[PDB]
Amino acid sequence: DIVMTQSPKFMSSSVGDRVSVTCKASQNVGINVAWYQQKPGQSPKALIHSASYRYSGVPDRFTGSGSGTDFTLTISNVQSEDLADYFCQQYNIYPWTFGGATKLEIKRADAAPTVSIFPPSSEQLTSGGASVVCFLNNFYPKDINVKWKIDGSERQNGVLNSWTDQDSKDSTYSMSSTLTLTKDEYERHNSYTCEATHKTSTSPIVKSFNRNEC
Amino acid sequence: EVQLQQPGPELVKPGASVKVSCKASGYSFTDHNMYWVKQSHGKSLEWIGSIDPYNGGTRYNQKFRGKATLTVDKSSGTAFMHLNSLTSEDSAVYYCYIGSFYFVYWGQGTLVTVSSAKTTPPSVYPLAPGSAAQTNSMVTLGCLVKGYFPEPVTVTWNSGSLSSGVHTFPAVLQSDLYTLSSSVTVPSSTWPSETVTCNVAHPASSTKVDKKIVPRDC
Numbered sequence: 335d336i337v338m339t340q341s342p343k344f345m346s347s348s349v350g351d352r353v354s355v356t357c358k359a360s361q362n363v364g365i366n367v368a369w370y371q372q373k374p375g376q377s378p379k380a381l382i383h384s385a386s387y388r389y390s391g392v393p394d395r396f397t398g399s400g401s402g403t404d405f406t407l408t409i410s411n412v413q414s415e416d417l418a419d420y421f422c423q424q425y426n427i428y429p430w431t432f433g434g435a436t437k438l439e440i441k442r443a444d445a446a447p448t449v450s451i452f453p454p455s456s457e458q459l460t461s462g463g464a465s466v467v468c469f470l471n472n473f474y475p476k477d478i479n480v481k482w483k484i485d486g487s488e489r490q491n492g493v494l495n496s497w498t499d500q501d502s503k504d505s506t507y508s509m510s511s512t513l514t515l516t517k518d519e520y521e522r523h524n525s526y527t528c529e530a531t532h533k534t535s536t537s538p539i540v541k542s543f544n545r546n547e548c
Numbered sequence: 549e550v551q552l553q554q555p556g557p558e559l560v561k562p563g564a565s566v567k568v569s570c571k572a573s574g575y576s577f578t579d580h581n582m583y584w585v586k587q588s589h590g591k592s593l594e595w596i597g598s599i600d601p602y603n604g605g606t607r608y609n610q611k612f613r614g615k616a617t618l619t620v621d622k623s624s625g626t627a628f629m630h631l632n633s634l635t636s637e638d639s640a641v642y643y644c645y646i647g648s649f650y651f652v653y654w655g656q657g658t659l660v661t662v663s664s665a666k667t668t669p670p671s672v673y674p675l676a677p678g679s680a681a682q683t684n685s686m687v688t689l690g691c692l693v694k695g696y697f698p699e700p701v702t703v704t705w706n707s708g709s710l711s712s713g714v715h716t717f718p719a720v721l722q723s724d725l726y727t728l729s730s731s732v733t734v735p736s737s738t739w740p741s742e743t744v745t746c747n748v749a750h751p752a753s754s755t756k757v758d759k760k761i762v763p764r765d766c
């Protein structure tokens with residue numbers, strides 16, 4: 335089976351820059367190589383066939399080159415909407431095979447997270463459980479840390495975190511953090527605190543509520 | 549216009565079989581071979597095989613021979629992929645697609661989960677700001693979609709007419725149950741005065757829930 339080896343695995347580019355992805359075939363495949371774009375939660379979209387023929391409807395900023403074993407996808411004047419995985423495929427010989435995806439991140443100015451904390455809903459409380467949610471929204475770059483405190487004490491068990499793919503519109507990232515406790519532990523404490531630490535500031539963005547308190 | 553319609557998500561027990569369909573329309577069915585492709589979470593794509601509706605001939609990736617069987621029913625324009633002896637290694641989105649020099653069209657894919665764990669509908673919890681409020685700003689609201697199996701759920705806000713400001717976070721799996729959240733950000737002058745509702749669909753359990761976000765009661 336032909337092995338398609340793609341590089342780099344991750345690439346980061348400002349809008350307007352020129353990115354290129356390479357695809358190396360383990361054996362000669364002539365020009366029967368295609369390039370694909372796949373945005374998150376979407377089906378793959380063909381960009382290029384026969385190594386250099388752009389499909390109808392694809393922007394002319396996408397170009398393909400190469401022959402034999404070395405193939406290259408070029409994106410001129412990169413745009414924020416170009417954020418996606420990219421991968422090649424050879425269809426010279428059966429089985430058809432695919433390169434591993436290259437993830438393209440678009441660069442943007444740093445942004446501090448927007449932090450919000452939410453107490454458990456009354457309907458969750460009626461079922462004996464209590465989840466405290468904290469959103470850290472629309473920040474750049476992607477690295478971020480979150481800390482929970484209960485009545486001022488750090489709390490490490492029972493937290494589950496999740497991160498979005500880069501936003502298609504503003505090229506930022508978001509993260510959700512959920513602290514889950516029994517209704518009993520939640521009702522034995524008063525103060526609930528979410529702290530976000532991001533390179534935009536040396537000071538954590540702190541967000542809190544008290545279980546009482548109109 | 550060309551369409552390849554694949555059915556919705558499937559949960560199957562280990563050792564069982566699944567038959568995924570791909571219904572074609574908007575073009576002459578025998579004009580194009582139908583390719584099948586596997587996408588496992590975070591892995592690349594694998595060509596499984598193809599079938600040619602014109603003559604019924606099939607071609608298989610040798611790694612999938614004995615496991616996939618491709619058929620077509622020309623009378624309804626439907627291609628089928630049968631997969632036997634399933635294990636958790638087979639959990640993936642399975643795609644059908646067609647192509648030429650002139651276009652390429654993929655179906656939406658059919659997520660197949662191979663697991664022993666049972667279907668469990670989500671519990672859906674509104675996330676409203678604690679009595680804090682604000683003036684002339686944005687307010688972020690949320691929805692907690694907790695304790696469901698299998699993937700996926702779909703979350704929209706105001707039946708999908710609220711688009712910008714929305715973040716739906718990837719689910720987390722803990723002890724055979726998924727949990728996700730979604731946030732929406734709207735001007736404070738529009739909520740609570742205008743309604744904001746989270747719509748959660750869980751096709752595996754036939755669950756449809758609309759959770760209106762209401763201000764917290766002190």
Ligand SMILES: C[C@]12CC[C@H]3[C@@H](CCC4=CC(=O)CC[C@@]43C)[C@@H]1CC[C@@H]2O
Pocket residue numbers: 368380382383384423425646647648649652
């Ligand atoms: C391989 C491919 C599907 C099959 C296509 C191929 C472009 C060339 C082509 C022309 C044909 O008439 C037969 C199908 C094929 C062989 C497509 C390029 C990308 C897509 O995945």
